[PDB]
Design a protein around this ligand. Structure first.
Ligand SMILES: CC(C)[C@H](Nc1ncnc2[nH]c(-c3ccn4cnnc4c3)cc12)c1ccc2c(c1)S(=O)(=O)CCC2
Length: 167
């Protein structure tokens, strides 16, 4: 159960590994995997596309039914849906996309959603094509998340810069 291996403990509750979140989910089958979602839960590329592809589109069919019944999420918000073959649950969290002009103050609100779950496997919110400074996103995670978070960052160059900045 939550058999995370090869992580480096940065703080009492934040761990980090250079790994693909999809491969980690397949090996660990954690209680919760966090998806770096958008407000309409359309998993078209990046982390969301890769998680959805690993469920063979089951995540997208379920997300479409959630949107039809509940409407879109807000930036900074989340919803809990099935984790299918990857996890018991998937927590879909919307971080701000600064490449499309959304406010960075909402990154704290996005990480706050992690606090409803004791243990999570997660990506670095708003990083990559969402345009936030990835080291800043790690600082927000460390300052906001109190529950136990295992971050998978699929880039050794970024992993090394994050660990070097953190110490
Ligand atoms: C900063 C990056 C290093 C990091 N990337 C990732 N971090 C962790 N696990 C990952 N798996 C893959 C992947 C991507 C194509 N794939 C196709 N088949 N399998 C895969 C597997 C990407 C990836 C990252 C962190 C957050 C966000 C992004 C990217 S994003 O650009 O998707 C926008 C949303 C926020």
């Amino acid at each position: 159960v939550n058999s995370f291996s090869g992580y480096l403990k940065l703080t009492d509750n934040v761990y980090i590994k250079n790994a693909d979140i999809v491969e980690e989910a397949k090996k660990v089958k954690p209680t919760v995997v966090v998806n770096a979602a958008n407000v309409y839960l359309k998993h078209g590329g990046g982390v969301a596309g890769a998680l959805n592809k690993a469920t063979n589109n089951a995540m997208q069919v379920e997300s479409d039914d959630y949107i039809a019944t509940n409407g879109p999420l807000k930036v900074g918000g989340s919803c809990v849906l099935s984790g299918h073959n990857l996890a018991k649950h998937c927590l879909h969290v919307v971080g701000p996309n600064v490449n499309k002009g959304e406010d960075i103050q909402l990154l704290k609100s996005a990480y706050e959603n992690f606090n409803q779950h004791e243990v999570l496997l997660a990506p670095l919110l708003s990083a990559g094509i969402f345009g936030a400074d990835p080291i800043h996103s790690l600082r927000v995670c460390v300052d906001t998340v109190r529950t136990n978070v295992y971050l998978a960052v699929f880039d050794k160059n970024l992993y090394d810069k994050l660990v070097s900045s953190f110490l």
